[PDB]
Amino acid sequence: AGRIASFLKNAWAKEPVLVASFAIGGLAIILPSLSPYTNYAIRINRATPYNYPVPLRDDGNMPDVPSHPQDPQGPSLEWLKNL
Amino acid sequence: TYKFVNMREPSMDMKSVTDRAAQTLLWTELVRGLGMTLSYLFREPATINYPFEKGPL
Amino acid sequence: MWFEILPGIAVMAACLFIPGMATAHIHKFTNGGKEKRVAHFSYQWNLMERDRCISGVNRYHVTKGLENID
Amino acid sequence: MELVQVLRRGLQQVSGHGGLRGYLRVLFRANDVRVGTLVGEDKYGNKYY
Amino acid sequence: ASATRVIQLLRNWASGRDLQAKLQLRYQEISKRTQPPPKLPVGPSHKLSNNYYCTRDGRREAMPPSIVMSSQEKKAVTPAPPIKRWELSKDQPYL
Amino acid sequence: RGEYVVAKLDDLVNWARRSSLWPMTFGLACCAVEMMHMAAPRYDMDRFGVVFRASPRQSDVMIVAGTLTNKMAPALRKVYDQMPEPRYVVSMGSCANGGGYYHYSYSVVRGCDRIVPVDIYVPGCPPTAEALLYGILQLQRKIKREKRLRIWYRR
Numbered sequence: 001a002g003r004i005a006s007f008l009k010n011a012w013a014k015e016p017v018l019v020a021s022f023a024i025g026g027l028a029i030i031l032p033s034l035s036p037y038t039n040y041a042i043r044i045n046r047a048t049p050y051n052y053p054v055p056l057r058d059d060g061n062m063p064d065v066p067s068h069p070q071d072p073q074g075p076s077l078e079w080l081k082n083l
Numbered sequence: 084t085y086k087f088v089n090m091r092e093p094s095m096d097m098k099s100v101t102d103r104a105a106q107t108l109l110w111t112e113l114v115r116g117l118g119m120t121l122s123y124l125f126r127e128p129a130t131i132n133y134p135f136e137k138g139p140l
Numbered sequence: 141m142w143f144e145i146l147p148g149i150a151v152m153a154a155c156l157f158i159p160g161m162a163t164a165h166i167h168k169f170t171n172g173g174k175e176k177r178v179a180h181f182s183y184q185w186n187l188m189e190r191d192r193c194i195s196g197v198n199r200y201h202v203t204k205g206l207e208n209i210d
Numbered sequence: 211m212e213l214v215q216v217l218r219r220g221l222q223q224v225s226g227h228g229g230l231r232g233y234l235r236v237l238f239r240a241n242d243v244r245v246g247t248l249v250g251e252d253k254y255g256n257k258y259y
Numbered sequence: 260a261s262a263t264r265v266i267q268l269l270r271n272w273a274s275g276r277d278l279q280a281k282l283q284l285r286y287q288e289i290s291k292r293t294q295p296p297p298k299l300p301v302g303p304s305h306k307l308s309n310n311y312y313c314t315r316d317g318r319r320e321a322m323p324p325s326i327v328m329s330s331q332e333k334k335a336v337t338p339a340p341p342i343k344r345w346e347l348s349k350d351q352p353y354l
Numbered sequence: 355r356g357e358y359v360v361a362k363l364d365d366l367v368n369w370a371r372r373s374s375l376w377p378m379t380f381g382l383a384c385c386a387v388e389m390m391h392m393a394a395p396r397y398d399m400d401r402f403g404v405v406f407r408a409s410p411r412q413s414d415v416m417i418v419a420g421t422l423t424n425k426m427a428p429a430l431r432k433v434y435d436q437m438p439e440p441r442y443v444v445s446m447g448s449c450a451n452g453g454g455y456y457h458y459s460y461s462v463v464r465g466c467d468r469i470v471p472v473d474i475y476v477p478g479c480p481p482t483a484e485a486l487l488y489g490i491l492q493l494q495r496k497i498k499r500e501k502r503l504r505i506w507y508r509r
């Protein structure tokens with residue numbers, strides 16, 4: 001405890017550069033997991049369409065996908081509009 | 084008599100250490116120099132233009 | 141008296157101003173008044189060719205509105 | 211108003227040196243445009259300010 | 260050539276001191292270049308009596324280097340008493 | 355007339371030289387220290403166009419300022435030979451004008467001219483930082499009065 005705190009204090013005095021790099025470098029590894037927006041970040045990347053949403057043939061029994069790009073059914077992203 | 088010139092041991096208090104750490108990280112004495120020259124930029128130049136005016140004897 | 145410094149940077153201020161002024165106006169002049177088109181991707185480049193083909197005068201910066209079609 | 215004071219002070223410089231032509235003469239030939247007081251003029255034509 | 264007060268603060272603030280109290284450029288505070296005629300003093304020997312050179316010379320009072328031993332118990336003696344270690348300053352100790 | 359255009363090109367060339375001559379960083383002795391006072395803010399040599407560039411490959415006027423001695427005379431002439439054309443050498447101070455105080459000693463060359471073609475001579479021991487300030491400007495008048503192309507068009 002006392003040795004550890006003194007070693008930090010001796011570091012912070014002898015060198016302020018690597019401790020600052022080690023500190024902010026250390027954080028850059030941990031909070032990405034704890035962040036509650038990282039699952040949102042992948043959703044944003046998934047939302048952005050670079051290729052065409054190629055249509056698929058109808059054979060019945062397909063309620064999920066819409067028949068028109070205005071129908072209420074289908075994947076909607078009003079979460080991202082407010083976000 | 085004589086006066087010692089430079090052996091001033093810096094304090095190791097957390098305030099002093101952070102002050103030195105801020106000084107090293109956020110360059111301050113370098114900025115102190117820049118502010119110095121800028122102040123010494125808006126002065127009046129000591130030059131005199133030649134023969135139209137001449138130095139004092 | 142520090143004012144004498146200003147004439148030096150004054151002409152310099154104009155000197156760096158000419159390039160950005162030139163490029164913007166040259167682009168505005170050559171490209172039919174409109175700002176020069178940017179083609180960072182094939183879709184933009186493909187779009188530019190279609191404009192040139194439908195222009196008839198072989199010039200991308202000649203946009204024909206609804207009066208072209210029936 | 212010190213800005214406009216030094217502005218009008220420079221204006222008294224150009225008027226003091228016999229108008230614009232005299233101002234350009236001393237700027238191009240004497241390199242300094244400050245006005246002074248004629249304390250004397252020698253026989254050879256050198257004005258002493 | 261008097262600086263505008265606006266930049267008087269700028270030069271003062273940027274250097275953290277009052278320049279206008281004492282400037283490097285000189286001004287009317289200098290001593291006048293024309294001064295009244297001075298009357299210089301006389302020396303101590305400018306006496307019109309009892310100023311004989313025999314009791315005033317300095318050159319003719321130097322003897323030849325005194326000789327103390329020539330190649331032609333006693334206590335140990337240093338050339339001079341050892342110096343006394345200088346005391347620390349009073350007006351300004353350790354910087 | 356071709357004389358007119360030659361004279362106009364004459365004035366153009368020398369004016370560039372006299373307003374941009376660069377005194378070398380060549381100091382010797384007592385005569386050099388006050389020459390710094392010329393470069394000091396009091397007189398500000400740089401305001402007259404000159405810059406104190408080292409490296410005789412990039413200098414015009416050589417300020418021989420101080421006592422010129424035997425052991426260095428080869429070094430100076432090597433330095434002078436390295437200077438490109440045009441090159442001028444202002445003998446500055448009485449030591450470099452003939453030997454100065456030590457004219458009669460055993461290891462001083464009596465005069466900088468015996469090694470180098472010496473231009474305008476500025477006297478003084480030392481010449482005041484202003485005394486050769488005229489010396490530099492008086493050389494600028496010498497540069498002004500040259501003919502060069504005028505001789506070439508009449509050669």
Ligand SMILES: COC1=C(OC)C(=O)C(C/C=C(/C)CC/C=C(/C)CC/C=C(\C)CC/C=C(\C)CC/C=C(/C)CC/C=C(\C)CC/C=C(/C)CC/C=C(\C)CC/C=C(\C)CCC=C(C)C)=C(C)C1=O
Nearest residue numbers: 378379380381382386389390393394405406407408417419
């Ligand atoms: C030993 O002894 C010594 C002395 O004494 C003998 C001295 O005195 C002194 C004291 C004197 C001093 C000045 C003190 C400093 C001197 C030193 C030697 C100390 C060491 C110096 C340094 C560490 C710093 C050195 C700094 C330098 C050299 C400054 C450099 C920067 C500058 C801005 C200055 C130079 C500027 C120049 C040359 C002008 C621009 C250059 C051009 C080429 C001109 C422009 C050209 C063109 C545009 C090209 C043409 C094209 C055109 C016109 C375009 C149109 C045409 C087309 C075809 C396109 C010292 C110290 C000394 O030790």
Ligand code: SF4
Nearest residue numbers: 384385447448449479
């Ligand atoms: S001329 Fe005089 S000042 Fe110059 S180097 Fe010789 S002795 Fe020194």
